[PDB]
Amino acid sequence: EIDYTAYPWFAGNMERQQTDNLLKSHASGTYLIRERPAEAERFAISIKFNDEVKHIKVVEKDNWIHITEAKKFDSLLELVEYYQCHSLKESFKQLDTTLKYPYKS
Amino acid sequence: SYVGD
Numbered sequence: 797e798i799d800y801t802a803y804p805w806f807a808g809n810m811e812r813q814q815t816d817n818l819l820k821s822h823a824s825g826t827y828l829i830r831e832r833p834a835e836a837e838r839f840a841i842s843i844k845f846n847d848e849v850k851h852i853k854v855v856e857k858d859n860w861i862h863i864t865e866a867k868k869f870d871s872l873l874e875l876v877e878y879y880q881c882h883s884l885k886e887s888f889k890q891l892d893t894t895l896k897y898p899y900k901s
Numbered sequence: 902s903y904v905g906d
Contacts, residue, residue, distance in 0.1 A: 840903070853903045863905065888904055 798873055805829055805876065805898035812842075812851060818899060819844045825896025829854070829876060839872060843884070845893050852888075863887070 800806040807815070810830040819826055819842060827843040841852040841863065852863045854875070860868040861875050864887035869875040876895060884891040 851903050853905045855905075891904065 798871065800829070800872065803873075803876075803898070804900035805895070807842075807899065809833055815842045815851075816849045819849045822899065822901070823897065825893050826899055826901070827895045827897065828899040829872065841876075841879075841895070843891070843893065843895065845891055850891060852884075 801808070805828050807818075807828040807830040810828075811833055815828065815830060819828070822844055824845050825843070827841060829839055829841055832838050832840050838856070839854040841854060843850050843852070854872065855862055861870065861872055862868040863875065863879075866887060867878075869878065880895045883894050885893075
């Protein structure tokens with residue numbers, strides 16, 4: 797298995813409120829992957845863009861991992877690694893940013 | 902509440 801605690805963008809289990817305060821002051825492109833407290837073993841991407849903190853569901857269906865149906869990956873790591881180099885705009889027109897800065901900076 | 906939905 798993959799130990800995600802070794803990555804500077806993994807916040808573990810964390811509420812949305814706790815995330816909004818952690819990313820409100822950082823630059824656009826600052827992000828973190830967190831476990832949703834209300835959904836066990838389901839994760840979300842939280843990305844700072846403009847002056848808001850967006851939250852994207854990480855869906856797991858039919859052994860694929862994806863934030864959009866049109867682009868799927870074999871693991872959460874491959875998903876995060878892809879959007880570190882490709883903007884979210886390709887599937888979220890209002891989110892023209894990559895996963896630029898891990899929130900542990 | 903989430904971008905997707």
